[PDB]
């Protein structure tokens, strides 16, 4: 429950999260619970001096901060806050990184009374004796009102070597009962992440991410079919600033094991790689939030909550902008915000 100095990594990210919780309009009790949860999940990384180099050159963020924030915008509602964390970041190698990440997940499982049996079922696939990169375990915490967060664990299909990416992904989906989910995935250049929901479900819910090195708006609309192809194509042109093709990720969520069809689609566009500085990245994110009837004012307050620097002084604060489509749900736009605990990428 102790605060940390702003010269320490834990002190910087807990200050950012506490201010982001006010933008999300969480009360003081939930804010206090979640800032301590993020500090605890970092382990010894919380006390590390920011003058030192980052312990792990993690791909979680460009400056290798083991924390990334995101805000999900529903029309007419204040955004929902989430935080992505790498619990094993302050470790020597990937094997130690993975063990520490699994320990933090089990602490969350014991605290909020949910099972890790589905995670234990995939342990040989994603945590071998000598794992390959680029990561071992990330945890996404959905900071819901009430103090009980939604937990997602991110796993690396390349953990047993890049040649076994599809083999590992196909085997994990088979063990989780999603024997036909892989057939619904679009053509991809990589399977970078497998997200697994932890909590209160009698059946496993999974999200499969696909990397597209040269994705077009035409292909993005084609992959979006679950209903709104035009919204996906317009979102592509607005965020990409259209070069014809852009690097982007698609996410495919499966919540049942019956049909083999996905229930969710997400177009995940790295706007930071397209614009010159964060002034333009924020502008494109603001135009999307505004035209979709969302709370673009909260975006600016969230950006100021993370850092006081001028947006034109760098690029990468607005890391990603995502369009989330879910059956029986209104569309949602998610803006991913970098911590920039170590560096601001130059324009």
């Amino acid at each position: 429950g102790s605060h940390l100095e702003p010269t320490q990594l834990g002190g910087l990210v807990t200050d950012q999260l506490a201010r982001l919780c006010d933008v999300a309009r969480l009360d003081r009790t939930d804010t206090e619970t979640y800032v301590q949860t993020l500090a605890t999940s970092l382990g010894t990384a919380a006390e590390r001096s920011l003058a030192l180099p980052p312990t792990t050159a993690t791909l979680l963020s460009d400056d290798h901060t083991p924390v990334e924030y995101s805000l999900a915008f529903l029309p007419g509602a204040t955004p929902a806050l989430r935080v992505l964390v790498e619990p094993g970041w302050d470790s020597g190698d990937l094997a130690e990184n993975g063990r520490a990440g699994l320990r933090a997940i089990r602490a969350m499982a014991d605290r909020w009374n949910f099972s890790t049996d589905q995670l234990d079922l995939l342990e040989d696939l994603f945590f071998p004796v000598a794992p390959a990169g680029p990561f071992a375990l990330w945890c996404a915490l959905e900071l819901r009102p009430g103090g009980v967060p939604g937990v997602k664990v991110y796993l690396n299909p390349a953990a047993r070597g890049r040649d076994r990416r599809a083999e590992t992904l196909r085997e994990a989906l088979d063990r989780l009962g999603h024997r036909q989910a892989f057939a619904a995935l679009p053509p991809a250049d990589d399977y970078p992440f497998l997200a697994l929901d932890l909590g209160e479900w009698a059946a496993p819910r999974v999200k499969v991410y696909c990397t597209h090195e040269s994705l077009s708006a035409q292909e993005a609309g084609e992959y979006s079919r679950l209903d709104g192809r035009d919204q996906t194509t317009d979102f592509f042109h607005a965020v990409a600033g259209t070069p014809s093709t852009r690097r982007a990720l698609t996410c495919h969520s499966f919540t049942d094991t019956v049909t083999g069809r996905p229930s969710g689609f997400t177009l995940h566009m790295p706007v930071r790689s397209y614009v010159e500085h964060d002034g333009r990245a924020r502008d494109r994110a603001a135009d999307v939030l505004r035209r979709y009837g969302m709370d673009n004012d909260a975006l600016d307050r969230a950006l100021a909550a993370v850092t006081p620097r001028p947006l034109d002084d760098g690029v990468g604060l607005v890391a990603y902008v995502a369009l989330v489509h879910q059956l029986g749900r209104d569309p949602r736009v998610t803006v991913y915000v970098s911590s920039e605990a170590y560096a601001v990428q130059p324009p």
Side-chain angles (χ1 to χ4, degrees), residues 1-117 119-178 180-199 201-204 206 208-217 219-221 223-224 226 228-230 232-275 277-311 313-329 331 333-344 346-347:
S2 290
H3 279 242
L4 299 172
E5 296 291 332
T7 58
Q8 295 173 288
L9 172 61
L12 188 271
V13 298
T14 50
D15 290 356
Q16 293 175 326
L17 192 69
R19 297 187 183 275
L20 285 174
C21 287
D22 280 326
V23 178
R25 306 195 78 249
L26 295 167
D27 59 8
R28 307 181 197 94
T29 303
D30 296 341
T31 300
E32 198 161 285
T33 295
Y34 289 149
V35 298
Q36 181 52 46
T37 298
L38 172 61
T40 298
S41 70
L42 288 171
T44 61
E47 293 73 45
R48 185 176 181 93
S49 173
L50 282 172
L52 289 174
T55 306
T56 303
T58 177
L59 265 63
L60 194 153
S61 62
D62 289 332
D63 73 340
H64 315 296
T65 302
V67 171
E68 189 184 42
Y69 317 105
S70 70
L71 292 87
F73 293 84
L74 302 177
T78 52
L81 179 62
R82 304 98 60 91
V83 58
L84 183 67
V85 66
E86 179 176 321
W89 175 86
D90 191 16
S91 76
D93 49 54
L94 275 166
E96 184 188 355
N97 191 312
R99 295 191 303 269
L102 290 170
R103 263 195 306 272
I105 294 300
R106 285 187 261 102
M108 303 173 180
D110 181 71
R111 179 182 181 181
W112 293 300
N113 304 336
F114 60 84
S115 172
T116 57
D117 286 357
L119 188 54
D120 306 335
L121 198 70
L122 314 170
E123 184 165 283
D124 58 312
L125 294 178
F126 297 102
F127 303 94
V129 292
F135 78 103
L137 188 149
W138 297 344
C139 180
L141 294 175
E142 181 180 329
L143 308 186
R144 310 166 176 171
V148 186
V151 184
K152 288 188 177 63
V153 54
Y154 281 75
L155 307 170
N156 177 28
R160 303 187 298 168
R162 279 174 62 90
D163 281 7
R164 310 183 71 181
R165 278 174 288 176
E167 178 194 351
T168 303
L169 173 60
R170 280 158 65 93
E171 178 63 25
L173 293 170
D174 282 335
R175 296 184 183 181
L176 294 169
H178 294 271
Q180 305 180 354
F182 184 86
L185 299 177
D189 299 317
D190 187 23
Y191 305 121
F193 314 109
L194 176 61
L196 173 65
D197 284 79
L198 302 177
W201 297 274
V206 298
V208 182
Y209 290 78
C210 299
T211 297
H212 312 277
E213 288 299 309
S214 308
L215 181 70
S216 65
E219 296 168 341
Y223 301 161
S224 68
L226 285 170
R229 163 186 258 165
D230 307 78
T232 303
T233 298
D234 295 357
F235 178 85
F236 188 98
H237 290 297
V239 177
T242 55
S244 183
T245 56
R246 293 289 197 176
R247 190 183 202 269
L249 279 80
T250 54
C251 182
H252 308 268
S253 305
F254 302 83
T255 51
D256 70 286
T257 63
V258 169
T259 68
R261 292 300 304 163
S263 60
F265 170 84
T266 299
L267 175 56
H268 205 259
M269 303 203 65
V271 67
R272 71 182 192 280
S273 305
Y274 308 155
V275 299
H277 53 80
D278 273 306
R280 302 288 80 88
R282 171 266 168 207
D283 281 331
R284 297 180 182 183
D287 291 332
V288 173
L289 296 177
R290 194 180 46 80
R291 288 194 292 100
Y292 287 51
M294 300 170 175
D295 193 1
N296 61 278
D297 286 353
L299 172 64
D300 294 325
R301 297 194 298 272
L303 297 177
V306 174
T307 173
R309 70 167 179 87
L311 275 60
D313 279 356
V315 66
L317 180 66
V318 182
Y320 293 89
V321 183
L323 178 68
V324 178
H325 283 167
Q326 188 169 349
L327 283 172
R329 294 277 207 174
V333 175
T334 303
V335 181
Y336 290 76
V337 183
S338 305
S339 176
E340 292 185 349
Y342 289 99
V344 176

